[PDB]
């Protein structure tokens, strides 16, 4: 959403900006990386759950409406999967300006 780090600005100017303002942006980026780290694991857990559901499709099924309910559930599951993919894309593009300084620093240090 908010673009704390302007696009096209040099690394040293960003260092000067970061040195002040009492690290509100440091707190924000720390929270963002923390929630990314705490989001990484549940995605794996639910993906394994989806694999288990797919593998066990030939069990606990006796009524046609049971198939309606189960497959509506799985379609909803991949629905929040695509929603979570969009959310993590937003999270990474929010940190994209911050990560943009790393290639410049590496190439200057080369």
């Amino acid at each position: 959403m908010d673009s704390i780090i302007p696009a096209g600005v040099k690394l040293d100017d960003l260092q000067v900006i970061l040195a002040k303002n009492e690290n509100e942006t440091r707190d924000k980026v720390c929270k963002q990386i923390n929630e990314a780290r705490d989001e990484i694991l549940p995605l794996r857990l639910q993906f394994n759950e989806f694999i288990q559901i797919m593998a066990n499709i030939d069990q606990e099924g006796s009524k046609q409406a049971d198939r309606m309910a189960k497959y509506l559930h799985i379609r909803d599951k991949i629905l929040q999967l695509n929603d979570r993919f969009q959310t993590l894309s937003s999270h990474l593009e929010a940190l994209q300006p911050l990560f943009s300084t790393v290639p410049e620093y590496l190439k200057t240090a080369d």
Binding site: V29, I40, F47, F85
Partner: protein, 65 residues
């Protein structure tokens, strides 16, 4: 990495597309393709997590310095 996560979940359905096509037993080639797809998805997730951790650590060390 942004495209890899999109295609991997698109490919796991693409890999299955021929699996249910014959359904529409199981071939060993399709089963091993699914196995390698899921294991590479897990591996790239782990690699992205490690890259995020390294980038974060670089963030604190540069901010401190």
């Amino acid at each position: 990495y942004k495209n890899k996560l999109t295609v991997c979940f698109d490919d796991i359905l693409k890999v299955g597309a021929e699996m249910m096509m014959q359904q529409q037993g199981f071939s060993q080639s399709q089963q091993k393709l699914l196995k390698e797809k899921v294991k590479l998805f897990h591996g790239i997730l782990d690699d992205l997590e490690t890259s995020l951790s390294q980038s974060s650590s670089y963030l604190e060390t540069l901010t401190a310095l």
